[PDB]
From a paper:
Pupylation is the post-translational modification of lysine side chains with prokaryotic ubiquitin-like protein (Pup) that targets proteins for proteasomal degradation in mycobacteria and other members of Actinobacteria. A single Pup ligase enzyme, PafA (proteasome accessory factor A), is responsible for modifying all pupylation substrate proteins and likewise a single [name] enzyme, [name] (deamidase of Pup), removes Pup from Pup-protein adducts. [name] [name] is structurally homologous to Pup ligase PafA, although the two evolutionarily related enzymes catalyze opposing reactions. Rather, before the catalytic cycle of [name] can begin, [name]-mediated cleavage of ATP in the active site must take place to generate the Pi species important for catalysis.
Author numbering:
A (entry chain B): 44 to 71
B (entry chain A): 1 to 35, 44 to 50, 78 to 508
Write the structure that this text describes.
Amino acid sequence: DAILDEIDDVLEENAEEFVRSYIQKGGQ
Amino acid sequence: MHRVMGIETEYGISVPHQPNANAMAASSQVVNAYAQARWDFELGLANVILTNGARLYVDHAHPEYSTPEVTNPRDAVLWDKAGERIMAEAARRAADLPMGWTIQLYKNNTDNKGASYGCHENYLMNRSTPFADIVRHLIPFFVTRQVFCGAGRVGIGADGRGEGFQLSQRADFFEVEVGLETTLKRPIINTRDEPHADPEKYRRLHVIIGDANMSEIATYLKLGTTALVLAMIEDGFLSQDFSVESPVGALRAVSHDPTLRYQLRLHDGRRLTAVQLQMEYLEQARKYVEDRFGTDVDDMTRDVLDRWETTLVRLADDPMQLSRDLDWVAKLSILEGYRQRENLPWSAHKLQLVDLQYHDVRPDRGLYNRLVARGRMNLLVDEAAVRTAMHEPPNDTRAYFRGRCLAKFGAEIAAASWDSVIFDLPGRDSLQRVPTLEPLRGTRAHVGDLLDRCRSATELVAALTGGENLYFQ
Ligand SMILES: Nc1ncnc2c1ncn2[C@@H]1O[C@H](COP(=O)(O)OP(=O)(O)CP(=O)(O)O)[C@@H](O)[C@H]1O
Ligand SMILES: [Mg+2]
Ligand SMILES: [Mg+2]
Ligand SMILES: [Mg+2]
Ligand SMILES: [Mg+2]
């Protein structure tokens, strides 16, 4: 699929590291 | 359509590879690198009012944007989208501060690890409307509106340990039916009533259950359908009882079934899916508008009703045809694409990355923004109007006076809030507080020509003295 190639072009590098590091303080 | 409303959005904030950054400093950099006037509180964190009438501030560990007061859901979409542009620009400007941090911002609601943050809707209502009716009629509406409002989420349960996809980011964080809380034990109906207006006339309904939406169609439907339901509640129009058994359990069960087949159990004995219950609210809203207005119905009310109905019909037929309109559908379309292309289980880290990066505010990296760039999402407003709304206020609320004063007399504004503007005039030992107590006064029709003719803040304050009950209340 064409749009999946565009998404592949912009995804963050080191996907597992990025996801594990996305840690937020609680808000409202 | 006419009802005073607004959206407050807390943004997720990431500063990778800066082991000595903290969320409060990073959030302050975003607010301070963009801008203006201080917020009138009468620590005090970074906290400013913009020339479009909006608030930009640090709410504990997140940068937050609050729209100016608007009167209809199209304008809510417009100034909310301006907030996304403001956040993206603020982060770009923060990269030029001496600290040099690369700050990423996400218009979403969770880190998928047990933390949630909020996108709140605010609606002005009659004080006379009995609160038990607000509760009884809104709980089933809020339990089910995620079928078009949901932004989608990979992971089941607050802690994300369960495998799978669900409709909403917020559902797993709601635990009770009614209450004051916004950060824990969250209630479907929040009961805080702080209207920043005449409390003998007005209630401000503070809604906390919605996901932040990227899609303009989703945000439009969220605010517009809710406003229609509020009109029916205020007028005592709903004679049915839509109450459901275990509404908190139902909210989560609806979210956890993206096939849209889960049946709610109503107290009156009926078994309806969330889409079916939404169709019951839509049918009542149609009868209400026909009964009340007949041919006097305005185009926007007609448009909200038509889009609500069309969306519900398409959800019941085949939800994937809404991939250009709804966030959870557009996101699921990407997710299932990768699942088929690469045979990934729902626990794959790439799927978590898609779930989060969908909401990245960068025009070049955020996945929703890439869908728009490639013409694959329907829009409600155009970018030129969004850019103007970053700097100019709505014309038909008191945000007009607030934003135009800041643009024209910024140097002499000591502070501002929703219900006043504080002037510091040359040669005065005292500050001049101009109350703006009515949300529908202080509009362009009220003060626009006066502001045009005034060349200094001293001239304006002079022309306004003793005229408070003319221009603003
Ligand atoms: N009379 C009114 N009626 C409806 N909406 C209003 C309103 N006055 C202000 N609003 C809107 O409500 C929102 C208020 O923003 P604000 O950030 O102060 O909310 P809040 O009081 O829930 C944050 P906090 O919980 O930290 O106090 C804005 O979007 C504003 O446009
Ligand atoms: Mg707020
Ligand atoms: Mg907040
Ligand atoms: Mg709020
Ligand atoms: Mg408040």
